[PDB]
């Protein structure tokens, strides 16, 4: 056939480029970073009404100060999360402190290109890693299967990503509040989702310095959705 670590004539790794196509088929995940916190939101996308939607876990805690959202082949994310949690806790063991968000992200991205003929293929999932540390404040990173990670003020991944990213391009500014970010994620999720957005098929979360990483209750999110509907009807 051909090597798994083969370069194309254009100078790209075939397998890495193909894994990016798998991520495009994944459900939408959006992250928005503010000076009051970073918000993470995901489309759950249940394949059937009999599937209990609260068992869909596409937003995950890595540490008290770091959260993570996923898009693509979500089964691949489990070992990445396990490594991230181990790296975060191990650093606390060695250094009696919280680990930097960038250092955590870099540790996850080191796994990415460990494939060949190590694992047999790249990961088929992209991660939005959000967190806070004392040195660089609130941060949002986009970790890819290429091993590359970009920091973002706001980022969307998944099937509705380019439409959402264009929307995030217009909406984001450096003075956003946490509440404004929450509604903004909900607004853009509602725009790109196939089914009508509600508290059962969409999930919110955030990371603040005080309270750390928190996944939002369906009751809490439902109120924010109702608040969104009213403010859009307000003009």
């Amino acid at each position: 056939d051909r090597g798994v670590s083969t370069f194309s004539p254009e100078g790209r790794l075939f397998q890495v480029e193909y894994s990016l196509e798998a991520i495009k088929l994944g459900s939408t995940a959006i992250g928005i970073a503010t000076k009051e916190g970073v918000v993470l939101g995901v489309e759950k996308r249940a394949t059937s009404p009999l599937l209990e939607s609260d068992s869909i876990e596409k937003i995950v805690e890595i540490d008290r100060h770091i959260g993570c959202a996923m898009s693509g082949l979500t089964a691949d994310a489990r070992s990445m999360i396990e490594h991230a949690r181990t790296a975060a806790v191990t650093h606390n063991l060695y250094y009696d402190e919280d680990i930097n968000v960038e250092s955590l992200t870099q540790s996850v991205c080191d796994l990415a290109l460990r494939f060949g003929e190590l694992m047999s293929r790249p990961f088929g999932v992209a991660l939005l890693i959000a967190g806070h540390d004392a040195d660089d404040g609130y941060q949002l990173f986009h970790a890819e299967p290429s091993g590359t990670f970009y920091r973002y003020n706001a980022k969307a991944i998944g099937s509705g990503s380019e439409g959402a990213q264009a929307e995030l391009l217009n909406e984001w500014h450096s003075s956003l509040t946490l509440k404004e970010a929450e509604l903004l994620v909900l607004k853009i999720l509602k725009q790109v989702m196939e089914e009508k957005l509600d508290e059962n098929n969409a999930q919110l979360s955030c990371i603040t310095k005080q309270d750390g990483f928190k996944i939002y209750d369906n009751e809490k999110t439902a109120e924010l959705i109702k608040e969104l509907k009213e403010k859009e009807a307000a003009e």
């Binding site: 051909r2 370069f7 254009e10 100078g11 060949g116 290429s146 590359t148 970009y150 973002y152 706001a154």
Partner: protein, 231 residues
Amino acid sequence: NNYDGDTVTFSPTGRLFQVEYALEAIKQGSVTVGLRSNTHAVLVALKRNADELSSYQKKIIKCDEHMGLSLAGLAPDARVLSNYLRQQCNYSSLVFNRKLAVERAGHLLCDKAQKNTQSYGGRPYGVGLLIIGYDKSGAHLLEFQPSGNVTELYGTAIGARSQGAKTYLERTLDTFIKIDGNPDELIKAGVEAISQSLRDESLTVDNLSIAIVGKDTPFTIYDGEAVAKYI
């Protein structure tokens, strides 16, 4: 064509296409410039962002107090190679109480890259490196290609549109080599060199990355408002 499926295969004309494709990844990468005098050596790098919300990808990596490099191509491969350099620099210090010569560092990088071009299963590195350093024989600038070829130069550039900066340095050769004991003027020449590779975009405060090493100057990277002075 039929001979580019893996790195272990020569073409009928004696070419290694996988290595050439890895070389192509460097050409897609953002421009970075290297140049030196007899007292200092300078790296200048144009960082690239994903979009307006994103950060600008870091291009320069410190290897020791007296050595470091800039990258163009696959960033993770630069991290692997720079980590290797950090270890080798460190082995020399711990075992021999000796700072690693820049020329020897180049020889080590050449040999590491070479092993990936002759064996089955692996792939060539998809990144180019510009290594600067100051050792017992003064200032140095190296250009690394993932073919294994390492070259000691007065100045150079790699990445997209790097030919413009390279021609400029070829003209300015006699001038910038003489900039001794003046770090700011040497950086200026590097910033002017990398400017010959720009189109549509210009050098902004979070776009530009500069590093310097010299006689009484540890390897230090300048980003953010620290490079506004040179814009």
